[PDB]
Amino acid sequence: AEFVPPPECPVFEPSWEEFTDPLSFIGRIRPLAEKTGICKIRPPKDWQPPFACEVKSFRFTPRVQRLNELEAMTFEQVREYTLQSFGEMADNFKSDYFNMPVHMVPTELVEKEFWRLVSSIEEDVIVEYGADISSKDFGSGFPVKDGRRKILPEEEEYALSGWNLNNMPVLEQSKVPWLYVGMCFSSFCWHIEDHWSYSINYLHWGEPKTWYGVPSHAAEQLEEVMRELAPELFESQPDLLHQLVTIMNPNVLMEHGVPVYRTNQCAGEFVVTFPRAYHSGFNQGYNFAEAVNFCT
């Protein structure tokens, strides 16, 4: 059977008056976005933050990911890349897999093929991605007043903007942004954030990032479906460890009454996940994202 795309999550296009402050805006859209788990925010057209990462020194060792790892139970280790050398590998993989220029591959085709490969036992596809990349060690994608890099006058409005993820509040009453370097089919499984916190993700550039989200009111139903279909060796594991292998086709959740919403996060767009909103997804191609957990 072919993959059935879930319904689209809400997309918001705030004006310059509404793009004022993120927390104020997120609080106003909450009555709708909390009912879908995730939402997308498109900044005004002329809000274009410049990429501040030192690409001349950005070197990292990605990790290997096999799409049908869970179906194999029912050695692939890697080289150091630069941001450019990784992009050349990522584009070569996608163009060779689909036999067409990378920007010509439709997003619905990659989505259908991704979930086919996840459940396919007759074809093993291996991809790589950069995760667990702290902006404190590699530098943020947004301009910042750090004491280790120079910002221009044109960059100052973005270093001080409330939508700069380095300026989000991360202290709960009684933390730095992380980086993601993706390629086609690189994916993250279903999870919620620590302390059930909010999370905001900005796609600096590259090909889209496909999201799936579940509202918080269905969190227990997802976990029940997950426990009923997960392998017996992983069902008894704590959720912190179990969330490392909780890959599941969204149609499986939808067939059991779990509401799922999707979206294609494009370059220059924000995605916000609400408290206890399970989410997962995959990258359509070579891209660069930055994310942080914040609190209200």
Residue 94 annotated as lining a ligand binding site: no
Which is it for the CA torsion 286, 287, 288, 290, positive or negative?
negative
Residue 201 annotated as lining a ligand binding site: yes
Q: Is 129 in the site for ligand DQS (CB under 6 A)?
A: yes
Indicate the SS3 state at residue 121.
coil
Judged by beta carbon distances under 5 to 8 A according to partner kind, the member of Mn ion, ligand DQS, none in contact with residue 209 is: ligand DQS
Q: Specify the residue, 246 or 283, whose C-beta has the smaller distance to ligand DQS.
A: 283
Residue located via tokens 């994916």? 187
Contact string (CB under 6 A) for ligand DQS, positions 138-177, x = contact? ----------------------------------------
Q: How far apart are CA 52 and CA 242, in angstroms?
A: 35
Residue 136 annotated as lining a ligand binding site: no
Q: Is 123 in the site for ligand DQS (CB under 6 A)?
A: no
Judged by beta carbon distances under 5 to 8 A according to partner kind, the member of Mn ion, ligand DQS, none in contact with residue 214 is: none
Q: How far apart are CA 185 and CA 125, in angstroms?
A: 9
Amino acid at 55: V
Judged by beta carbon distances under 5 to 8 A according to partner kind, the member of ligand DQS, Mn ion, none in contact with residue 186 is: ligand DQS
Long-range contact list for 225-233, CB < 8 A, 24+ apart? 225/252, 225/253, 225/256, 225/258, 226/190, 231/70, 231/73, 231/74
Q: Is 31 exposed, middle or buried (0-12, 13-18, 19+ CB in 10 A)?
A: exposed
Only segment of 21-29, 118-126, 161-169, 180-188 that touches ligand DQS (CB under 6 A): 180-188
Q: How far is the CB of 167 from ligand DQS (least distance, A)?
A: 20
Q: How far is the CB of 143 from ligand DQS (least distance, A)?
A: 22
Judged by beta carbon distances under 5 to 8 A according to partner kind, the member of ligand DQS, Mn ion, none in contact with residue 131 is: ligand DQS
Q: Is 182 in the site for ligand DQS (CB under 6 A)?
A: yes
Q: How far apart are CA 283 and CA 67, in angstroms?
A: 13
Is the CB of residue 124 less than 8 Å from the CB of residue 66? yes
Q: How far is the CB of 280 from Mn ion (least distance, A)?
A: 9
Sheet holding 126-134, edge to edge: 11-12, 38-41, 270-273, 198-206, 287-294, 178-182, 126-134, 63-66
Q: How far apart are CA 2 and CA 24, in angstroms?
A: 41
Q: Is 70 in the site for ligand DQS (CB under 6 A)?
A: no
Q: Is 283 in the site for ligand DQS (CB under 6 A)?
A: yes
Only segment of 96-104, 181-189, 234-242, 248-256 that touches ligand DQS (CB under 6 A): 181-189
Q: Is 209 in the site for ligand DQS (CB under 6 A)?
A: yes
Going by the annotation, the residues of the binding site for 2-oxoglutarate are 129, 199, 201, 209
